[PDB]
Design a protein around this ligand. Sequence first.
Ligand code: HEM
Length: 153
Amino acid sequence: VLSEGEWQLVLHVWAKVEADVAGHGQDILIRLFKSHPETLEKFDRFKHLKTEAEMKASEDLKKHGVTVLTALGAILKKKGHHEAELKPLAQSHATKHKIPIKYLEFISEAIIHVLHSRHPGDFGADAQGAMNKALELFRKDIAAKYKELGYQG
Ligand code: HEM
C-alpha cells in the first residue's frame, strides 16, 4: 500500500509526463524494444521495425505509446483503487496479447528510466522509489488476475 506521500511523488512526476505524453510513450517503447527484443515480437503491428531510427519514425508506434501511457495515467490517478481499470487490461494482456508478467516488469523499468531522463528534478530517489512501488502494485494486481485466468505461469 503506498502512502499518501508516496502517491504525491508519483503523481507529481506524472503531471510532468502529461505535457508530452507522445514523446514519453515513444521513448519508453523504444527502450523496452531495444532492451528486451522479445517484447517487440509480441506486436505484429511493430515487428517490421529493425532500427531505432525506424522506430522513432513510426507514427503508429507513437500513437500506441499514447494509448499505453493514457491507460497507465488513469490507473495511477486512482491511487491503488484501480480494479475497474485493471480488469480489462489484465484480461486482454493475458488472454489475447499473451504478455508475460515479466514483460510488465520490463516496461516498468523503461518507464522509470525515461522519467529519470526527462524529469530529474522531480524524480530523485524518493520519487523513484515511490514510482517503483506504484508499478509494483500495478504488476501485483495484474498478476493476481493472470493467476485467476491460468496465466501466471
Ligand atoms: C504499462 C503497461 C501497459 C499498459 C498500460 C498497456 C496498455 C495497453 C492498451 C490500453 C492497449 C489497447 C487496449 C487493449 O488491448 O487492452 C494495449 C494493447 C496491446 N499491448 Fe499493452 N500495455 C502495457 C504493456 C504491454 C507490454 C509490456 C506488451 C508487450 C510486450 C504489450 C502488448 C500489447 C499488444 C501486443 C497490444 C495490441 C497492440 C495492437 O496490435 O494494436 N502491452 N496495451
